[PDB]
Amino acid sequence: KQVEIFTAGSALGNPGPGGYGAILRYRGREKTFSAGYTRTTNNRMELMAAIVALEALKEHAEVILSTDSQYVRQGITQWIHNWKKRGWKTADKKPVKNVDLWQRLDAALGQHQIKWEWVKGHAGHPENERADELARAAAMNPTLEDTGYQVE
């Protein structure tokens, strides 16, 4: 009864139009999520894709979450536990960049048992490539405001 999730984010500027793609497969069937934002960043969309996919889970699950985001990998495996120790502030006492989405992602993890698959490259990873096609299509026709995006 494992859930497989494949996520990607894309943005056309720093900040610029951006979007996310997420694919969820469970007991043979698939569900897809994609939305575009008018002013955002690649890293925020990479986070948003994982958030939206995980928030769609209505029951505690065993999840295999595949993403090619280096940013998500570093947050999950290197930074988040230290950020929590420090009250979500850097050494200069400013809030961590994208703290709104990191905290929302941490809540979206819920009680799921997640095995993260950090993929490098689209070759041999068709669902990741498709998630990226969804993110890019959403970035080309954005409808939402990424209200939490802040300069710098």
**Cα separation, 47 vs 41, whole angstroms:** 10
What region, left, alpha or beta, does residue 113 occupy, with left being phi > 0 and alpha being psi -120 to 50 degrees?
Answer: beta
CA 67, distance to chain mean position in Å, is 8
The tokens of 70 are what? 């280096």
Resolution expressed in Å: 1.3
* Technique of determination: X-ray
Written as one string, the DSSP assignment of 35-80 is EEEEEE-HHHHHHHHHHHHHHT--S--EEEEEE--HHHHHIIIIIH
What are the Cα distances from residue 131, in Å, to 46, 49, 87? 11, 9, 33
**Could you tell me the domains of the chain?**
1-152 (3.30.420.10)
